[PDB]
A paper describes a structure:
The RNA-binding protein (RBP) [name]-43 (Trans-activation response element (TAR) DNA-binding protein 43) is mislocalized and aggregated into neuronal cytoplasmic ubiquitinated inclusions in the vast majority of [name], as well as approximately half of FTD cases. [name]-43 is a nucleo-cytoplasmic shuttling protein comprised of two RNA recognition motifs (RRMs) that bind TG-/UG-repeat nucleic acids in a sequence-specific fashion and are indispensable for its roles in RNA metabolism. In this study, we provide evidence that the physiological [name]-43 state in the nucleus is oligomeric and that this oligomerization is indispensable for the functional role of the protein in RNA metabolism.
[name]-43 NTD crystallized in space group P63 and two molecules (Mol-A, Mol-B) are found in the asymmetric unit, whose structures are virtually identical, indicated by a root-mean square deviation (r.m.s.d) of 0.612 Å (Cα atoms of residues 1–80). Crystallographic symmetry generated three intertwined superhelices of [name]-43 NTDs packed against each other, building a tubular superstructure. [name]-43 NTD adopts a compact fold comprised of a five-stranded β-sheet (β2-β1-β5-β3-β4) packing against one α-helix. The head region (on the right when viewing the β-sheet with the β1-strand pointing up) of [name]-43 NTD is positively charged and interactions are made by residues mainly from β3- (Asn45), β4- (Arg52, Arg55), β5- (Asn76) strands and the β3-β4 loop (Ser48). In contrast, the tail (on the left, viewing from β-sheet with β1-strand going up) of the molecule is negatively charged and is comprised of residues from the β2- (Glu17) strand, the α1-helix (Gln34) and the β1-β2 (Glu14) and β2-α1 (Glu21) loops that interact with the adjacent molecule. In addition, at each interface, β2-strand of one monomer forms a parallel inter-molecular β-bridge with the β4-strand of the adjacent monomer in which the main chain atoms of Glu17 (β2-strand) forms H-bonds with the backbone of Met51 and Gly53 (β4-strand). This interaction is strengthened by the guanidinium groups of Arg55 and Arg52 that form salt bridges with the carboxyl groups of Glu21 and Glu17, respectively.
Residue numbers in the entry: 2 to 79
Write the structure that this text describes.
């Protein structure tokens, strides 16, 4: 039951969005601040490549380590 930081552009200051009590994040929780959003990715700090977040059935799941304080960048389609 944390907040994760989410942004639509890595330079922009992110906003915190609430997780579920189980540590997941609903896609709907994201799309209420980022309408259109279809997913998330984040900059892996060890490789500096982008890394996708798992989404199954409208539910986002944390990286194995947890969400931490990383900045999650929203994906949009097309």
């Amino acid at each position: 039951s944390e907040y994760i930081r989410v942004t639509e552009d890595e330079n922009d200051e992110p906003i915190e969005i609430p997780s579920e009590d189980d540590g997941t994040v609903l896609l709907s929780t994201v799309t209420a601040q980022f309408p259109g959003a279809c997913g998330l990715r984040y900059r892996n700090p060890v490789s500096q490549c982008m890394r996708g977040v798992r989404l199954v059935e409208g539910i986002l799941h944390a990286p194995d380590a947890g969400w931490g304080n990383l900045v999650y960048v929203v994906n949009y389609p097309k």
